[PDB]
Structure formats: structure tokens, C-alpha cells
């Protein structure tokens, strides 16, 4: 049946302009319905941007009509969205959608990151216990991964051998670089005595580092 | 343009309950309110349109009502696959708008957080870094307040917090709080405390360490 799929740049410099493509299968964009573009910010807040009716009419959300434009290619059955003088407040997830009775069909949506940062490898640091905090039975080890760009980071413990008791948190922003941390709580039987290694991987930077948590001095 | 407010921000309930979500408008929107569901890392899907009409494929435990201003999404019987975010939008006026969303969580037995604070690794310090990390794991409910103390003083600079979404096994939450400073900074203070205050205790849960403690 109907099918929508977005595509476009995944990371751009601020103030630059760009175009996000939406290619639809199973339906003609000259047949019927309004073909929209919607973005969702980091918080689940949805925001309508603009659409191009099947007839050709275009409508834009007043707060963005100064820097955007919806266009199409009936031949290849797609429509695009151009954004100019983009700001960082623009990083989010973009969806192309068909509207008729509300928003009918959506696509997987594509994520956009507006940053000035340059691909740089992360710093993986072992987090052994402070020598005194570790209430009996279970012990918690950590793993700090700071200043890496772009996302995502891949983190596992003991090549995957460890799975339960693991906590990986969302990457945040320290300046314009990400920092992420992961934890693992294992029985107080394992640690010093059994090697635990966290494995981080940064596809972008083609980096890959194993880091062993050894008891501190 | 007509603002759509969703009253229930985060609703916590049991499987097999009865949840009624509310969606209000600024101005009349006739019956042009649709409801969309959004399971994590998934796109919104039409659930209810025309205020009441159930979109093709939507089970029965979903019913909507409301006329140009006050609308509701009722889930007769809540299931685990209803655990998601629900949005509502009008399609009456030019700039189409959505609400802030209503997250539907799962209710579970309260749980105190397991706190752990680690001094910076010698690897980072040797490079001039000084990050103190604290983990507040597997706790419930969501609401908690972490606070850092250095030599007994509160400190707001550097703190970068991070919270995981509800766990899909024990239904708990987890947070890490990081404090960053330059080694110079780090080496003039000696007592580092990670103080938390959850609702499962009348007193704050605190983890701490003294730097001159090998």
C-alpha cells in the first residue's frame, strides 16, 4: 500500500541550507491528499512544517516560512524540503507524511544534526570503585566516554558476555561534543578476581577501544 | 494558532485498567482531532481521527469523543502494547498543531535507588581532566533530585545529568550525574559528595569520598 521514506544529509554546518527528500511508493502524489513534512524535537514535541497538495498548492507554518520551501518531482514521485540559515535549534527528527483524515501514513523519519563539530575520537576511562562504596553482594563498575562526535557510540561489557545489570545512558552535550556513560553491577565475587572489560566503538571515527576496570591503588 | 493542551502529562497505571486522556483546544476545531500513538524509536501512527472514527487496524479498547474543544481518548482495557506516547492534533486551521504529548508509563512497587560515586580515574587526571561520576540506579518513581556537595558546598557548574527511559523488565528508571572540573580545581578540595533525595526515604541517600583516601 502507501509507503513513505525520507532521506538526506545527516549532519550539517549551521547557517547552511539543505534539502530533505521524501520518496513515496504505492501512491501518486498528483492523485490526492496533502503531502506534508513534520519534525519532532528532542522531547517528543511534534511540529508541522509545510505540505504540497496533490494539485500543487503549498502551505507553510508561519514561523518557518521565512527559511523553507516544499517542492516536488511528479516524475520520480517525490517531494523535497529545503531549509536555509539553519540553526542548532533545528537538530531533530524529520518525517514526511500524507495528510487527509489527520496524518494517515508516516515514514521512518530521518534525524538531522546541526553542529559545527568535527569527527573526533572519544575518551574511554575506566571507573573502578572508590575503594569504600560497594554494599556487599553487588558491586558497580563504570565507564566514562567523553568528547566524541558525532553519534552514536557502541558500548558492551566483556565482548557481550555481560548483559544483565548493565546501564547505558543517553549521550548529552558538554560543549559541542557528546559524553556518555555505562555501568554494570556484578556480584562481589567477580570483580577484582575476574576481568571485566567495557568495549566502546565509534564507527564514525573508525575508533574501537577496550578498557579494563582494574582495582584502584 | 489554536493551542492544543494535553492534560495528563505522564499517566501511570496497571495493565487492564481504564485510562482516559484529555486533549483541549484554544478555539473551536469542530471534530478535527486525531490521536496518534508512538512506541519508542517508532514513528507516530494514526489511531483515532474525526474525534471518534477509529482508524483501520486500531483495536477496540480505543475510543475517542469530544466536540470542538474538549476531547478524550479512552482505552477500555490497557495492555502492555499501549505503553507509549500519545499525541493529538487538529486539522481544522491552517497551521496544523500538536500537543505536548502524554506519556503512559507502567505502575510498579516503589524502589529506592542504588547510588555509586566514583573518583576520577588516574588516566583522565593525567590528561588534566577531573570528572566525578555518580550512578543512581534502578529506582522508582521517576522523580528524584540529585545534588553535589564539595567540601560541604553545593555546586551547580559542570553537572550534566542523564536519565534512561523506563526499563522494559523491572520498570525502573536510572540516572547518572556527572561533575566536570580541571585537575587544578579538583585538587584544592577534598570531600566529594553525591547527595540524592528520593521519595522512598525521609533522609537523603548520600555517597561520598575523601580525596586523601588512596
Amino acid at each position: 500500500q502507501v509507503k513513505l521514506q525520507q532521506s538526506g544529509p545527516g549532519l550539517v554546518k549551521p547557517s547552511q541550507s539543505l534539502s530533505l527528500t521524501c520518496t513515496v511508493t504505492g501512491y501518486s502524489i498528483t492523485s490526492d491528499y496533502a503531502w506534508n513534512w513534520i519534525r519532532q524535537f528532542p522531547g517528543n514535541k511534534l511540529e508541522w512544517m509545510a505540505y504540497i497538495s496533490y494539485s500543487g498548492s503549498t502551505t507553510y507554518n508561519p514561523s518557518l516560512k521565512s527559511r523553507i520551501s516544499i517542492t516536488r518531482d511528479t516524475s520520480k514521485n517525490q517531494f523535497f524540503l529545503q531549509l536555509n540559515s539553519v540553526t542548532t535549534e533545528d537538530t531533530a527528527i524529520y518525517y514526511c507524511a500524507r495528510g487527509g483524515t489527520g496524518f494517515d501514513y508516516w515514514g521512518a523519519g530521518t534525524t538531522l544534526t546541526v553542529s559545527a563539530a568535527a569527527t573526533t575520537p572519544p575518551s574511554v576511562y575506566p571507573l573502578a570503585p572508590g575503594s569504600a562504596t560497594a554494599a556487599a553482594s553487588m558491586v558497580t563498575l563504570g565507564c566514562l566516554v567523553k568528547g566524541y562526535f558525532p553519534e552514536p557510540v557502541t558500548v558492551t561489557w566483556n565482548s557481550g558476555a555481560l548483559s544483565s545489570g548493565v546501564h547505558t545512558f543517553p549521550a548529552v552535550l558538554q560543549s559541542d561534543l557528546y559524553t556518555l556513560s555505562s555501568s554494570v553491577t556484578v556480584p562481589s565475587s567477580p570483580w577484582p578476581s575476574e576481568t571485566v572489560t567495557c568495549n566502546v566503538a565509534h564507527p564514525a571515527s573508525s575508533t574501537k577501544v577496550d578498557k579494563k576496570i582494574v582495582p584502584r591503588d | 494558532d489554536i493551542v492544543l493542551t494535553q492534560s495528563p502529562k505522564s499517566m501511570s497505571m496497571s495493565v487492564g485498567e481504564k485510562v482516559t486522556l484529555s486533549c483541549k483546544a484554544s478555539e473551536n476545531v469542530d471534530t478535527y482531532v486525531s490521536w496518534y500513538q508512538q512506541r519508542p524509536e517508532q514513528p507516530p501512527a494514526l489511531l483515532i481521527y474525526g474525534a471518534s472514527n477509529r482508524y483501520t487496524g486500531v483495536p477496540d479498547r480505543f475510543t475517542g469523543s469530544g466536540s470542538a474543544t474538549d476531547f478524550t481518548l479512552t482505552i477500555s482495557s490497557v495492555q502492555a502494547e499501549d505503553l507509549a506516547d500519545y499525541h493529538c492534533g487538529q486539522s481544522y486551521s491552517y497551521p496544523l498543531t500538536f500537543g505536548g504529548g502524554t506519556k503512559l508509563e507502567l505502575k510498579r512497587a516503589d524502589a529506592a535507588p542504588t547510588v555509586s560515586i566514583f573518583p576520577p580515574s588516574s588516566e583522565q587526571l593525567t590528561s588534566g581532566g577531573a570528572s566525578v561520576v555518580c550512578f543512581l540506579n534502578n529506582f522508582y518513581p521517576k522523580d528524584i533530585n540529585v545534588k553535589w556537595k564539595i567540601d560541604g558546598s553545593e555546586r551547580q557548574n559542570g553537572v550534566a545529568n542523564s536519565w534512561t527511559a523506563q526499563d522494559s523488565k523491572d520498570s525502573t528508571y536510572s540516572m547518572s550525574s556527572t561533575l566536570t572540573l580541571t585537575k587544578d580545581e579538583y585538587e584544592r578540595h577534598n570531600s566529594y559528595t553525591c547527595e540524592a533525595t528520593h521519595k522512598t526515604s525521609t533522609s537523603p541517600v548520600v555517597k561520598s569520598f575523601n580525596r586523601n583516601e588512596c
Partner: peptide, 8 residues
Amino acid sequence: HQLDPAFG
């Protein structure tokens, strides 16, 4: 081809 007010 019934579109809501906001559309078209």
C-alpha cells in the same frame, strides 16, 4: 477525496 479544512 475528503480532506480536512487545514488541507488544501
